[model samples]
Target chain A: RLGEVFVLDEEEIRIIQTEAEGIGPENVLNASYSKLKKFIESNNSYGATFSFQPYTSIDEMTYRHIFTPVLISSITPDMEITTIPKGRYACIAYNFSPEHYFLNLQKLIKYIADRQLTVVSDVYELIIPIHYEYRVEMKIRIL
Target chain B: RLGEVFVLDEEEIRIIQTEAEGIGPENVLNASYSKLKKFIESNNSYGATFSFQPYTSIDEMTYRHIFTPVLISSITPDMEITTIPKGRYACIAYNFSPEHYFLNLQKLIKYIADRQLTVVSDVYELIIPIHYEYRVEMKIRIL
Candidate 1:
């Protein structure tokens, strides 16, 4: 399928990052896990989590963003927070597991390709709590 | 001089990251330059810009944040932003040149060491658009 279509008026998220290559795919968010969790948990948060791509860039260069959506009021007097501007996104839902994460996003990239919609921004991994284990939405913003 | 002292009062900011090792520090913000500028320039931008450290992490890990502090109203419907938590920061203001940046921050790290302060977060390269070329404040939060 072409996944699903949706819109986010805007969303506030706290984030952190690390080398995506040297650490490997399954490990994109591992390095910043503790720090992000410690701080985010202290705030009002949801079970859904997110990340961005070009984690593997156009070149061989790599990095990954590991973030959690939060209540604007959850923000403390600390580091700044990032916002996802309201836009149309296409997403593919799937079961979650580290080994399968990379391929899923690649699949969505192709899905976007088949339809010829231009990718306007970074592709995202929007995860929902499922399997009691995980559920993922390979999401991207497009025009 | 040990730069200056300041407080952020939980300022809001927008951000993006690129590979620091492969692209190089002088070029860390290069890749995302166009996108960030297109969106940010659409709003009121400022002369001062900021970035985070562990641009080179302890493991030889590398990545860099290229960000602009914005008027929350400036954020459009596009991407997420990052925050620099409120607290006491130590700084070293100096001339900016890609070649000279690495060393200036190193100097500030040593300065904080002299005060027996523990670094609680990322080291920052806060650039004040000067020299007509540049001026940078090597800043870090501490306890």
Candidate 2:
């Protein structure tokens, strides 16, 4: 079952992508987080940063993940601007270690499919770190 | 009347503040935008930037505006971290020139008050510019 159903307004967002080779989970996660951290320190007037791994093949564990700056107006040198299109979305929350994060996504997908729902966009994880643990609110645009 | 209602998840944000000494409209607006623009170019991974002038006194035109960077993970030097709390919001859209922007916000506030809605937070203007015009989607957290 979907946790909550809600409508969202269209938003213009800016992002940067990082890639990892092989299945080195720690290295990938660390690199992506540091890249985003350094970027924010230098930049001003931005909101929260979000990170997500777009899995092409779960078996390979070869992954590409993206870090997003909150919504912005103008573009600079190397940032990519994208839109989180307006639509209905289902958001589920969980806290997971790197080892089980992928499996959690699979569970979410199963939940969607079992309910006869179709995912309209790539999954996005709103990373929330409290004290020592990482809490993730995962969302997918659905129709 | 409310334009639309939407649910947005929590997001961590970074911001910079700009203040004007007196009733200098053009100078304040231009300086705020330019200050934010310069910050983004010099900084690294943050996203698009937004500017909002919180009205304190209409007569003095003495104002303090905030510029938000896209959401970010870590804090660099000389920036403040704020969380845009997750909840449902009521949004209204309008196009206004810098001169009329403040007035438009009053109109929006009146709409909310007329309906006996309670505002939970300061107003946020999602600044969307199309060529020469400024399209602002105003939002307020309500109960």
Candidate 3:
């Protein structure tokens, strides 16, 4: 067993790309989630679906983000599609709010450094609902 | 002026994916580079192109690696296609040997932690060859 600090040989993950609407950080998540929810309702996708909230870039003073639907196999011909390559990923799990998100991320970074590990891919957060609150599982490609 | 530790607003990167042949770590790179070179010769791709050497998975004793091309726009219809999403990324650059790769990565991790940064996308190593050697530029989505 690889334990909490383990290696993941993940297969290629296909995703359907959807642009986030609105201006505020909170509104972005809501709008993107709404779009993803609607897309899922209309289209018949396979397997369990996950969403990736990617911080794209800075525009003057505001930050940009995009929400992508993690596809198992199904493709929506009309929508833009992309993928994260299959690779060995370093993963971590935690429950935190929007306010405390960065604090926890700092901890994860420390953990990676102390272990002398290297990550190759971007960090991804998997939104998991547990009990009543949401738990975020973070993953990054590691060598 | 955000200094060396700044945010980047990168647009989406389109890429053509290719598989490599050969065994062991060193051979894998050579084979992948050969394929990429051949691809560039045959097809006219836009912008600067980069290749990703992904640690796909393991089969019993050995690990699997795939070389994916980071494209600007061109896509080979016959081959598998993928894109890295547009997002803000925390970035760092370094020159290190293959043996010291992990060590440098650890230092980067510590840097991120010390700065209390939160990265949201998978870590990416942009391979740059300098003076007959390799320099890896690392980038990850930050929140």
Candidate 4:
């Protein structure tokens, strides 16, 4: 239901990437997601889409997002393919909706803090299809 | 002692940078530090040095290091100046030495894990002067 912990194993994602830092619904990953969503729709990509924080200051967060192209070979010159080094993670899952996404994310962070669980890597988001409805998980890797 | 936690407040560091990924003294931050230390000694500048993780995979970590120059304008074309925007951090301080740095770092990580503390940003290292002695602190920002 919430604050559910698990191991993610690992994934070497083949992706078309984009990055941005901005306020809610505008810049941040959403602006980057615009391209990813277009790429996914126009190219008929299905499965996992992910986002990671490379670094941060108190005032703003810089985020990088990944979309696995339907065919990596077909990716455009403007696009670069890369992988997010993977590791063990603690997670929280919820029925996805844009409005509630961040709200739930904070709740998951609260879980990590309250429990004193150590996080080893970036806290990233993965949007995946459960019957393709909309299921998203916030994954913070642990030691 | 072990795992003494505190806030680093923030910093806006101006630095010349280098990066590498390798094992032990051959690479990791040490190799990058080789560049920073050279620039520092060659320029005769001194104060603090830092290193950060941009992203990582399970097998190996890619690292970035920073050195504050005596004069930002004097930097060579081969170098670039940038800032690591600051944040409030959860930290672990230890005596600095090449041989035992990582061993103590793992102890600090263990502190985070045993406590279930959440880490929100990259865990970075700073070697700063305490009476100019070797004092290094590993700082990880929190929720």
Which candidate's TM-score is highest? 1
Candidate RMSDs in Å, in order, are 10.7, 13.9, 18.9, 15.3
DockQ of each: 0.05, 0.02, 0.03, 0.03
Tell me which of candidates 2 and 4 scores higher on lDDT.
4
Error of 3 at A121 (Å): 2.6
Q: Is the docking of candidate 1 incorrect, acceptable, medium or high quality?
A: incorrect
Q: Is candidate 1 or candidate 2 better by TM-score?
A: 1
Q: How many residue pairs clash in model 1?
A: 17
lDDT of 3 by residue, B67-86 (tens): 34452323332233335556
Which ten contiguous residues of candidate 1 chain A have the minimum total lDDT? A16-25
Winner on TM-score between 1 and 4 is: 1
lDDT tens readout by residue for model 1, B1-143 = 43444433333233432223232243433332233333235322222223333234322323244445543322332233334545567767666554555666566656665766655445565545542245666566655
All candidates: TM-score: 0.41, 0.35, 0.36, 0.38
Better of 1 and 3 by TM-score: 1
Model 2 residue B27 CA deviation in Å: 43
The DockQ-based CAPRI class assigned to model 3 is incorrect
Q: Write candidate 2's Cα lDDT for B1-143 as tens digits.
A: 43433334434233432222232334436543333334334222222222222344444332223444442323332232333444446566665466655566666656665775645444555555456355556666555
* Model 4, span A1-143: residue lDDT tens: 54455556764333444322122223423433344354344233322322222212222332333444333233332233333334456777776665566666666566666776655434555655555255666676554
Q: Candidate 2 residues A1-143, lDDT tens each?
A: 33433334434343432222233334435443333344334222222222223343345332223444442323331233333444566666666466555666666666676786755444665555556355666676665
